[PDB]
A = this chain, B = another copy of it.
Amino acid sequence: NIRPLHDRVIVKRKEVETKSAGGIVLTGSAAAKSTRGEVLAVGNGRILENGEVKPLDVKVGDIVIFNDGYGVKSEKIDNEEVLIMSESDILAIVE
């Protein structure tokens, strides 16, 4: 169990789909890495300039869409891959 700091969220990305709009399976560089993940850990909140802290909009259990970049980090917990990344890199939440 790990808890993020402030406005960070820990997610795990979904497995890359093989078939695409039919039975055609994609293998190699064609199957781009999925940019949809499942939130597991949510931090306490971002710190404002004046000092008080406000809760995050993303809640544990939702599905998020993010943009991969330099701010996103991958680390191994329980022999599993998770992403520790800032909330500003969250784009939208599915449903």
Chain A interfacial positions (CB closer than 8 Å to B): 1-6, 8, 10, 21, 35, 41, 44, 47-52, 54, 57-58, 65, 67, 73, 75, 79, 84, 87, 90-95
Q: Evaluate contact between A1 and B75: CB separation under 8 angstroms.
A: no
A65 and B58 alpha carbons, distance in the complex (Å): 22
Contact B93 A5 (CB under 8 A): yes
Number of copies: 3
8 Å CB contact of A48 from B21, B44, B49, B91: B49
Find out whether the CB atom of A51 lies under 8 angstroms from the CB atom of B54: yes
Question: Could you jot down 19 A-B contacts, CB within 8 Å?
Answer: A1-B94, A1-B95, A2-B94, A3-B93, A4-B91, A4-B92, A5-B58, A5-B87, A5-B90, A5-B91, A5-B93, A6-B57, A10-B92, A49-B49, A50-B50, A51-B54, A65-B75, A65-B84, A75-B91
